[PDB]
Amino acid sequence: KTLNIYLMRHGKVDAAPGLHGQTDLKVKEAEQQQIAMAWKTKGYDVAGIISSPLSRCHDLAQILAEQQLLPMTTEDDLQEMDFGDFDGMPFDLLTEHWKKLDAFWQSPAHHSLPNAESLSTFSQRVSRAWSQIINDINDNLLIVTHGGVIRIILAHVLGVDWRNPQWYSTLAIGNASVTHITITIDDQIYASVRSIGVPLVE
Amino acid sequence: KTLNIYLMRHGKVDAAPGLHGQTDLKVKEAEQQQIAMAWKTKGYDVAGIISSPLSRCHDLAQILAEQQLLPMTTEDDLQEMDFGDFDGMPFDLLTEHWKKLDAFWQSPAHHSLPNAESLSTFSQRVSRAWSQIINDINDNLLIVTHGGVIRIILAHVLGVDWRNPQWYSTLAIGNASVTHITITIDDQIYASVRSIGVPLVE
Structure with a gap:
């Protein structure tokens, strides 16, 4: 037997583009309905939802759970990276502040944004949760999570180096x-x- | 000032009569029309089509080109690896006592099949063509090609190692x-x- 894992990103955060980390950025109500209606009418077969704690993920997972009558849980390791000091700030307000994140994007092997989680810490907790999930799995699961998290999972499965900034x-x-x-x-x-x-909607 | 490149793979190849009484792997004609209809109704807008000259890619590109009245060209660097262009080459028992390309799955360049291209040649000829494509490009582009080709394009663009067998x-x-x-x-x-x-349909 073979089983299906669907990793879903949460949807657009009704905000100026920035470092949407562990600050609880909220998406629109009609926006979650779009995604939920899309997921249902596209006919996805899943027998359990694992979510990120954060509202943009959790609020959708919740809608899906009672839409299709399915078991749901959260996992704190599947939050996105804590940026610390710059966490939640739009990119335009970071012009006013430090231009040091360009050295973070250039090489995250030797950069952490003053109060941030390093990639080292972040990829650790993501892959640690991932290895547990694939070992515990029966039937199909949806994972409502963030893009940064999905990237690490894809880096692990395809066996590309997490240190690579281009990824x-x-x-x-x-x-x-x-x-x-698929596992x-x-x-x-x-x-x-x-x-x-x-994609699902817009 | 931002441009879309759509790398397509050809449809499912089934057994069909070919040249001189040989059995070819041809894409079913109705199944080609299913891809054509699905590309059209999904509303992908595009200026030109660059196809692989090979059998199954070229046919689909042809249908697409006159479906939406678009400029089409083949490009001989966008074909398969050419896994071995062998003829007799006393492969009387030599291809028989050969676990056929057991090191294409294993390694970058420690084997060949005394007729073929190595990964080093295949990657270089694709990426050279890709670099020529991304510099020539104005407006949107559909590239109808092979899964092998698409993988190296992604490897170059995402900056991942193409020597990685897991890729x-x-x-x-x-x-x-x-x-x-998108470039x-x-x-x-x-x-x-x-x-x-x-994907588009099955």
């Missing part, structure tokens, strides 16, 4: 995008990425 | 799958992989 620089995974990963279980565990970044 | 092993890109790369031209070329492997 986060160039791999845009959109809002309300289901990225299909196949017999002796020891095997995973293959089907279709990544597939 | 071909675990990364799937299905038949009739549009993968979206944006300024001082240099700036490419971001949007969606990858988005």
